[PDB]
C-alpha cells in the first residue's frame, strides 16, 4: 500500500560445464512485492550490462 517501493534485480554468474552463462534471471519471490498492481506505473532506473 505505501506510495512507492523499489526492487533490485541482479543476476550473479553461472557457467555450463561448457563455459557459458545465460544472462536471464527468473525467480518466484517468497512474498508479494506489490499488494495490488492496478495503481502502479512501473519504470526502471540504473540498469547496467557487462558487454565484455
Amino acid at each position: 500500500e505505501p506510495d512507492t517501493v523499489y526492487y533490485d534485480i541482479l543476476i550473479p554468474f553461472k557457467p555450463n560445464d561448457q563455459g557459458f552463462s545465460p544472462a536471464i534471471f527468473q525467480a518466484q519471490l517468497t512474498q508479494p512485492i506489490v499488494h495490488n498492481p492496478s495503481e502502479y506505473f512501473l519504470s526502471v532506473v540504473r540498469f547496467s550490462i557487462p558487454t565484455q
Binding site: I24, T30, Q31
Partner: protein, 508 residues
C-alpha cells in the same frame, strides 16, 4: 422399508428393460450459426520467442476454449569425435525420439492477456507433474494425443531397452487401444548416417493454461473479448527437445551425439470463433471460473547416492488465499543437468520416492506425520493420480535366472503427492476453500534416491492452485480471489442436491 430401527422412507424404481411409460420429451439442440477456424501466423518469429497477436473477427463473437499452436522445425545432429567408432547410424531404431511434451518443456514461460488483463503460467517445471493427473486413458487418447504424449516410466533410460513398454519405442510393438510411444510421431528424416543426421516435421502443442482447457470436457467460451494476444519466450537451452538412451554411449563414455542444432519457421496459432444467433441474447457482463498456477521452489547442497535416504525442510512461503489443491514433490536439481548437455539430453524425468511427508500449516505442525507413505498414496489416487502403486515408491527387483549373477533392481518413478485442502488438511472452523486473506506453510519432508547409477542432488517444489472468479465485460477485465467472506462461510446453508463428484468434474 419400515421395521428396522428407525422406520425408513420408501421408493420403487423400475428396471432397465422396461419403464416403460415415463414422460418423454423431444428436445432441440441449438447452437449457431457460423463456426470457423482461423490461422493467425505468428508475427515476428525467432529462435528466442514466438509472438502471436490476434483479435476476434467480430462483435459479440464467443471464443472456443481449446487453443493450440503448430510450429514447423528443422534439426541437425553432429557426431562427437571421441569414443569413435561410432559404427551404425547416429539415430537408432528404439533408442531416440522426442521428449514429451516437447514445446511446452522448452518454454521458459508463456504469456497471454485476455482483454488487457495479463495471465501467465510457468510451463517448464509445472508440466510434468500437472500432466501425471488427472488423466484417464479415455482423455489421454483424445485431445492430448497430438503432442508427443507418453510419460517417463524408468528412472534411467539405459535399462529400459528393450521393453514391450519402453518409453521411446517405434509405433509397432505398442499394444492395441493404449497409449502409444514417442517414436511413433511422424516426421521425415532427410539423411541419417554416421557423422550426420538431419530431420524435419511439424509439431502441434496445446496451449496449457486455464481458463483455456486440455481435458476433453467442454464449457462456455469467453465472449465478449476485444483482443487476445499470446507470447512465447523459449527456454535458452533448446537441446532439451531431444531425448536419448544412455546405453548407445558406450563404455567411456562420451555420448555419440556431439551436439545439435534446432531451427524454426513461422508457426500459427489456431483459434475458433463461434457467433451466437440473433434471437437468444448474451448478457453484457459474464463471469467465469479462473484458476492460478504458481510454483515455489528450494535449493540444496547435500547429495545422496545411489540409494541413500535423508531429510529436507522446505522454505517458508506465503500464499494469498487458501489454495484449492496443492502438489509437493522432490526432483533432480535443475541447477545441474543443464551444463554439459549430454546429461541434459539423456536425463529422464522422474521424482525421488517420498518416504514420508510432514507439513506445518497455519497454526499446526506435524500434520500427516503418522501417515505411512503407503497411506500418502491412497490420497490422492482419489484426487486423480492414475499411476499404479508399484510406480509410486519406485523400485522393482527383476531376477535373472542364470548361475551365477547378482539379480538386479530397477527404479521407476517417484510419488508426486497432493492434498486437496478442505479434504486432506482439515480446514479450521468458520473458514473454507475460497477465503482471503493471507496464510503461509512450509513442508519438511524426508525422501530417498532410488536411481541406481547417478548421484542425485535434489530440490523441492510446491505447485499451488488458487480458485478465483473473473468477470469479462466490455471493456473491463475484473478478477477476484477470496470471493467468499468469513460470515458467509459460517452458516452457509448446505444442500443434499449436488455431491462431491460433480464438484470433481469442473477441473480440469
Amino acid at each position: 422399508m419400515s421395521n428396522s430401527a428407525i422406520p425408513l422412507n420408501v421408493v420403487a424404481v423400475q428396471e432397465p428393460r422396461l419403464e416403460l411409460n415415463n414422460e418423454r420429451t423431444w428436445v432441440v439442440v441449438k447452437g449457431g450459426q457460423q463456426v470457423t477456424y482461423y490461422p493467425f501466423p505468428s508475427t515476428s518469429f525467432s529462435s528466442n520467442q514466438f509472438n502471436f497477436i490476434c483479435n476476434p473477427p467480430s462483435a459479440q463473437t464467443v471464443l472456443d476454449r481449446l487453443v493450440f499452436i503448430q510450429v514447423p522445425y528443422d534439426i541437425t545432429f553432429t557426431a562427437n569425435p571421441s569414443h569413435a567408432g561410432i559404427t551404425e547410424n547416429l539415430l537408432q531404431p528404439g533408442r531416440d525420439a522426442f521428449r514429451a511434451f516437447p514445446i511446452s518443456s522448452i518454454t521458459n514461460t508463456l504469456n497471454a492477456t485476455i482483454n488487457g488483463f495479463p495471465v501467465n503460467i510457468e510451463l517448464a517445471q509445472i508440466i510434468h507433474a500437472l500432466s501425471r493427473y488427472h488423466t484417464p486413458l479415455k482423455v489421454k487418447n483424445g485431445w492430448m494425443s497430438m503432442q508427443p504424449s507418453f510419460e517417463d516410466n524408468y528412472q534411467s533410460y539405459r535399462d529400459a531397452d528393450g521393453a514391450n513398454n519402453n518409453p521411446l519405442g517405434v509405433f509397432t510393438s505398442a499394444a492395441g487401444l493404449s497409449e502409444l510411444p514417442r517414436g511413433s510421431y511422424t516426421m521425415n528424416v532427410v539423411t541419417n548416417t554416421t557423422t550426420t543426421a538431419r530431420i524435419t516435421g511439424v509439431l502441434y502443442e496445446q496451449v496449457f493454461l486455464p481458463p483455456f482447457l486440455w481435458d476433453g470436457e467442454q464449457a462456455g467460451g469467453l465472449a465478449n473479448l476485444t483482443s487476445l494476444t499470446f507470447n512465447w519466450v523459449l527456454n535458452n537451452n533448446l537441446a532439451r527437445i531431444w531425448s536419448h538412451s544412455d546405453i548407445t554411449n558406450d563404455v567411456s563414455g562420451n555420448s555419440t551425439i556431439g551436439s545439435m542444432n534446432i531451427s524454426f519457421q513461422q508457426p500459427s496459432m489456431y483459434l475458433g470463433f463461434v457467433t451466437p444467433r440473433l434471437n437468444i441474447p448474451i448478457p453484457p457482463r459474464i463471469t467465469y471460473p479462473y484458476f492460478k498456477l504458481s510454483r515455489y521452489t528450494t535449493q540444496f547442497q547435500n547429495t545422496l547416492a545411489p540409494n541413500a535416504s535423508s531429510t529436507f525442510k522446505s522454505n517458508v512461503v506465503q500464499l494469498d488465499s487458501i489454495p484449492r489443491k496443492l502438489y509437493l514433490f522432490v526432483k533432480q536439481s535443475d541447477n545441474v543437468i543443464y551444463q554439459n548437455l549430454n546429461n541434459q539430453i539423456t536425463t529422464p524425468d522422474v521424482f525421488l520416492q517420498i518416504n514420508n511427508l510432514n507439513l506445518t500449516w497455519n497454526n499446526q505442525q506435524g500434520i500427516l506425520s503418522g501417515a505411512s507413505s503407503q497411506n500418502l498414496y491412497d490420497f490422492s489416487v482419489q484426487n486423480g493420480y492414475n499411476k499404479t502403486w508399484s510406480e509410486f515408491n519406485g523400485v522393482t527387483q527383476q531376477f535373472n535366472g542364470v548361475s551365477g549373477q547378482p539379480t538386479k533392481v530397477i527404479g521407476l518413478e517417484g510419488g508426486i503427492v497432493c492434498l486437496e485442502l478442505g479434504k486432506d488438511v482439515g480446514l479450521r472452523d468458520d473458514e473454507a476453500e475460497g477465503v482471503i486473506g493471507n496464510f503461509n506453510l512450509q513442508v519438511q519432508m524426508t525422501v530417498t534416491n532410488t536411481n541406481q547409477y547417478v548421484t542425485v542432488t535434489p530440490d523441492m517444489y510446491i505447485v499451488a492452485v488458487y480458485d478465483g472468479t473473473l468477470v469479462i465485460s466490455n471493456t473491463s477485465a475484473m478478477a477476484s480471489i477470496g470471493v467468499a467472506s468469513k460470515e458467509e462461510v459460517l452458516n452457509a446453508r448446505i444442500t443434499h442436491g449436488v455431491s462431491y463428484n460433480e464438484l470433481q468434474r469442473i477441473y480440469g
